[PDB]
Ligand binder design. Sequence first.
Ligand SMILES: [Cl-]
Ligand SMILES: [Cl-]
Ligand SMILES: [Cl-]
Ligand SMILES: [Cl-]
Ligand SMILES: [Cl-]
Ligand SMILES: [Cl-]
Ligand SMILES: [Cl-]
Ligand SMILES: [Cl-]
Ligand SMILES: [Cl-]
Ligand SMILES: [Cl-]
Lengths: 92, 93, 94, 94, 94, 91, 94, 94, 94, 92
Amino acid sequence: MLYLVRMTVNLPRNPREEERLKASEKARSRTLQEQGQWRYLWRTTGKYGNISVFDVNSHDELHEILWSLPFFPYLTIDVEPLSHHPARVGKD
Amino acid sequence: MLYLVRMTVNLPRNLDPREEERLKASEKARSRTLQEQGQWRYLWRTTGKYGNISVFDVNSHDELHEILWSLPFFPYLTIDVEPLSHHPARVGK
Amino acid sequence: MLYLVRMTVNLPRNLDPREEERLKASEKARSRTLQEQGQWRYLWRTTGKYGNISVFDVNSHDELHEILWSLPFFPYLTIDVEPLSHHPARVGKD
Amino acid sequence: MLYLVRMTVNLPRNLDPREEERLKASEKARSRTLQEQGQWRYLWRTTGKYGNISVFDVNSHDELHEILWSLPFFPYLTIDVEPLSHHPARVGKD
Amino acid sequence: MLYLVRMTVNLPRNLDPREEERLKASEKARSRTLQEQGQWRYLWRTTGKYGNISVFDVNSHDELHEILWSLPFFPYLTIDVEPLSHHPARVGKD
Amino acid sequence: MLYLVRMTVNLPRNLDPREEERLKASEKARSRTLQEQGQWRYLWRTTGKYGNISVFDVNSHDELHEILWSLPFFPYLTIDVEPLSHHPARV
Amino acid sequence: MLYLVRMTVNLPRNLDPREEERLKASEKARSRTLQEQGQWRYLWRTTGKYGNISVFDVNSHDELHEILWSLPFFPYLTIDVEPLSHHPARVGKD
Amino acid sequence: MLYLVRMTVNLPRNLDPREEERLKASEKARSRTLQEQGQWRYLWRTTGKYGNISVFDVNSHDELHEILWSLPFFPYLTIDVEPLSHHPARVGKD
Amino acid sequence: MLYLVRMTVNLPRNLDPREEERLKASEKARSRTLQEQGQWRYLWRTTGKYGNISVFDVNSHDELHEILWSLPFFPYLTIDVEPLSHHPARVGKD
Amino acid sequence: MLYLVRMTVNLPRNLDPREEERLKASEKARSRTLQEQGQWRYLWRTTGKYGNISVFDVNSHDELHEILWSLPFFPYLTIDVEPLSHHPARVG
Ligand SMILES: [Cl-]
Ligand SMILES: [Cl-]
Ligand SMILES: [Cl-]
Ligand SMILES: [Cl-]
Ligand SMILES: [Cl-]
Ligand SMILES: [Cl-]
Ligand SMILES: [Cl-]
Ligand SMILES: [Cl-]
Ligand SMILES: [Cl-]
Ligand SMILES: [Cl-]
């Protein structure tokens, strides 16, 4: 199933824990994309966040994936279920 | 260039049943052509709703505007357009 | 899979009464079936209002979308769909 | 009577850990009790979020208020309460 | 149990003038009964607007729902319902 | 003159807990006096929330302003004021 | 006693031009009377828009409501009312 | 040329008491001057709130900006600006 | 003086396409004059929408108002007006 | 391609005055350059607020993103981006 997911990032104002967090975040998203759950990843133009499409088998699968993100504590997340559009040409 | 585009459809209640049929028909045909040529890259429907949430791939704002204006549904659409940029953490195209 | 769904009903003023009642009976029959079959798990009325707050139990987004699209009221419904996940503190079944 | 209740959790950042685990534990234990007793009927979590969306079954507004006020999390919660009524087309029990 | 209720009235332009009078007269008579019986405890006009702020005293969400649905104005009302609880610092009656 | 007044209270986390309970006292004593004087006419709690929903009865806007401004909680309150008028259908 | 009042005008536009002028005229007639007498203290035009920002000077809420209720435009107005108080730092007239 | 201007004040809680009084005094002094000179035409307080709702009478946007920018309170203000125009039905002379 | 002005167009579905063609031609002619004269300095269309986002450069609020009031489209427009000011970091002319 | 861009500046109260003055100076220098090069076409101040309304002239979403991301003020900005299209009734 497909979900359109928007995330905005707000990291704390305060060390070099920062750069290990960011590398950890980037490493996690690499795996999820490679394995197929994180189908699409874009950056909203002018923003610190992403707009994504996830392809998973349950609400809980998506929930756990998001929860597992290093950034999660600092994320504002919106989840929107997507359905097949009858006029679609090709695959959803 | 990529745009995330949301369209909400509000067709008049007083549409002649036959006219409404052919409006839907030409809309479908128009979006078919745009998908075939690639400008309308992704087309989905928000679960529980009419309309669509889409991703367009065009060369300029003006090209997208013309395309959207060309849709038979345009007079009855509420459209939100949102520019998308490459994400450095992206793996793939 | 569970979804929390809010529906608000706005029937046109100028609806022909026969049909309007024919439409209401149809809505009621369609929802009776979906409840009997288990897809429409919970159905409550938002007090003070003409609509409902529901929990649907289906196996895909598209299954839900088709169900909502099949409602006689659909053209007059304002719908909000919220995906629900398991809460670790939950005792018993979701 | 039934209420749809949404709770959004905003735990203090830069608040000691051992303390934070104790708080979460007492919250978890508190909701278990209430779920066992039946006042906290349904408990879900909105996909992608930290909080819960729930349905409470109590005998009065005051009883609900006291229950919510009793939650270890209460000082860090944003809470929306929405009364639920019987829906004429309901098949089965509310 | 107490409820705070905002009601805002929106009559259509096309409403037949004679039907409008019947609508208003039946509405006033309905509210008179409910105030005399005591379920409709307080009623105030929202100054500058066609609506009211009210406090209802009923035994359940369901009883409130039926009352509100029963109002002739109902098809033209936007209604916000808010459950009220006893306040600790309260002196006197509610 | 009647006003519907909503107050949401947001005490600071850093606030010394004893002052929280002495501020809560001053506040409790003030509302008591105002209710006894008829100016704080009705006082309810919004279910599930830390705040009140009230009806005040005073002779002018400025009078309401001074009363609210005088509350020990004022600096921590989010306040919404709206006027109420007599309703012709009132019984 | 002062109220800041915002008004948005939304006329049907499906009406007789001379009828529109009759409604328009007596609205302006009603507002002339209220400004002369003093209840309608100040009156400005919201720029780019068909509406006004007013300050009313009135001795009760009921007096303000009756005044606004009485306006020829009332059925076609969206109104916001906001009580004003004296500012301790005010040097001149209110 | 008239502007309706709303200002909401949010002084920080960790303010040095002396500084707070200094701040409040200089703000008051600045506003006195602007009112005396006629730029700050009207100055009211929204009832129940800490801020002001004002009408400024200046010659240009730029003038208004620099005036607002120069308020000691500025870094703690939330400000809304709205141009006003002369209303044809205006009896009297703003 | 500069104003950022957004206009959203809501033509009724009631228009004789003769009349619609006419309104459009008229609106276009008026904006031409206003652009040539310099009051309508910039004019863009928001991508995907039937409106315009514009910068006007006029004498006063009263002037902007009259200009907007005068547009053939005015009865069908939703307009937002927002004053702009010289920016300190601006390189060259505003 | 044109973009209408709104930016709101939210400098934290605890911002080291030394850091604040540095940022202000470098932000100003950066906007000067981008205006001189032409990508930052129009810049106005919202009357009575600490921000700006700008029109940017660039070749892609990505170019705009990189520009906005490079602003010294970026970590403290609320930014709204709005694509602009040619208006048929435009004169000159
Ligand atoms: Cl991200
Ligand atoms: Cl569609
Ligand atoms: Cl329903
Ligand atoms: Cl929770
Ligand atoms: Cl009423
Ligand atoms: Cl309280
Ligand atoms: Cl007016
Ligand atoms: Cl002030
Ligand atoms: Cl236009
Ligand atoms: Cl800036």
